[PDB]
C-alpha cells in the first residue's frame, strides 16, 4: 500500500527522469544539427564546418555528466540540512526549471539556453542518483530491501525504453514537434510533486538529529502496518550510536590511508572500466551507430525501440539472475562477454557487404551487448562499493566513485564522435580493449564477495597489501 505507492512515486520521479534524459538526445539529432547551423549562420553570417558542429554536439550531449559531477559534489553538503524529501522536492524544482529552459530554446533561438538546460538536467540527475537509494532503502523494511534495490535500475531501464519510444517519426520525431521532446519532462515532475508530499518522511534522518520520536513511530507504524515496531527502533538507535561512536574519515585521509590504497584503486578501476565499457554512448549515438551499420535509414527508430525493450527485459531477468549467479564470476563474465560481442560487432561492421544478411547481425550483437551489460556488472558495483569498505556507506568512497563515474561519462560522451570520425570501421575496438583490460584486471584483483563477511575480505586485502 503506502510502501508500494511511495516507491513507485519516487522511482518515477527520479530514475524515470534519469533514464529519459539518458536516451532522449539521439532521436532529434539531425533537427538539432539544422537548428545549430541556422542559428550560427544568422548570428555570425558564416557556415559551420562539420568538425565544429560535431564538437558543439558532443559538448551538448556530454555536459550532462559534468552536471552530474557537480550535483554529486553538492549533495553531500545539501543533505546535512535539507534531508531526503526536501532534497527530492528541490530535485523536482531543478527538473522543471531545466525542462522549461530546454523546451523554450527554439522559440527564442538560443543554443546557450539549451546548453544551460542540459547542465541543469545533469545536476538534477546527479542529485537524483545520490538521493533516491538513501530514501528507498530507508523507508523499506529489511525484508524486502532487495526488491527496492533492483527497482532503482528497473526504472532507469524503463526510462531509457520510453526515451527510445518518444522519438519515433510518428509520435515525437517530426520537424515541427522536436521541441516538445524536452517538454515531456514536466509530467514526471508534476506527478511526483503531486504524490510524494502526501507521504510519511524518512524516519532515520529525523531520528538522527532533531530526535522526533512521535513522528518516527507514526512513520514506522504506517510503513510496517503494525503498532509494535520496538525492535526496529532499537536497532536504528543502536546503529546511530555505533555510527557516532566512530570518527568519519574524509576523502583526503582516505586517499592518504595506505590500508585502503588497494581498495580505492580497485573501486576507481571498476568504475572507470564500467563507464568506459560503453552503454551511455550506445544510448546517445544509437541512431548514428545503426545508420553506419548498413541498416536502411527508414527503420532505425524502430531498432532503437527494440533496443530499449530488450534492455528492460534484460533488467527484469537480471533481477533474478543476480540472486543465483554471484558477484565476481558474474562481473568477469559480463566484461568478457562484452569484449567478445564488441569483437563480433566490429567484424560484422567491417565486412557487412559480403552477404546481404550480415548488416542484420549488428542488431543481434547489440542485443547481446545489452543483455551482457544489464544481466551482469550493470548493477553489481552499487552493492560492491558497500561490500568493500568497513562502514559500507563511506562518504569518501561514495564521493570518489561518483567523481570517477561522472568524469568517465563526460570523457566518453565528448570523445565518442571523434573516435568514430577517426575509426569509422573499427571504433568499437577501443571499447573491446577497455572491456578486456578491465576484465583481466578485476579477475586478477577482485575476490569473491558474496557469502563473505567484511572480516574475511579485510584480512585477505591486508595480506594482499604486503604489509
Ligand atoms: O542500469 C543501468 N542502465 C543504463 O542504461 C546505464 N547507463 C549507465 O551509465 N549506467 C547504467 N545503469
Author numbering: 54 to 520
Source paper text:
The high-capacity urate transporter GLUT9 represents a promising target for gout treatment. Subsequent genome-wide association scans highlighted the crucial role of GLUT9 as a high-capacity urate uniporter. GLUT9 is a member of the major facilitator superfamily (MFS). Here, we present cryo-electron microscopy structures of human GLUT9 in complex with urate or its inhibitor apigenin at overall resolutions of 3.5 Å and 3.3 Å, respectively.
Urate binds to the central cavity of GLUT9. The complex structure reveals extensive interactions between GLUT9 and the substrate urate. Notably, W336, N333 and Y327 form hydrogen bonds (H-bonds) with urate, while L75, I209, and L332 establish hydrophobic interactions. Additionally, there are some van der Waals contacts from V213, E364, C210, A206 and N462. Specifically, during the simulation, N333 acts as both a proton donor (73% of the simulation time) and a proton acceptor (76% of the simulation time) for urate. Almost all the substitutions resulted in well-expressed proteins with significantly reduced ion currents in electrophysiology and decreased binding affinity in MST. In the MST results, N333A, E364A, Y327A, and W336A exhibited much lower binding affinity, with values ranging from 230.9 ± 17.1 µM to 472.4 ± 52.2 µM, 681.2 ± 126.5 µM, 1080.4 ± 250.7 µM and 1149.8 ± 141.3 µM, respectively. The superimposition revealed nearly identical backbone structures, with the only disparity observed in W336, whose side chain had to flip to avoid steric clashes while establishing a H-bond with the substrate urate. Conversely, examining the residues implicated in urate recognition in GLUT9 and comparing them to GLUT1 reveals a dearth of H-bonds between GLUT1 and urate. Notably, the direct hydrogen bonds are more extensive in the GLUT9-UA complex compared to the GLUT9-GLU (docking model of GLUT9 and glucose) complex.
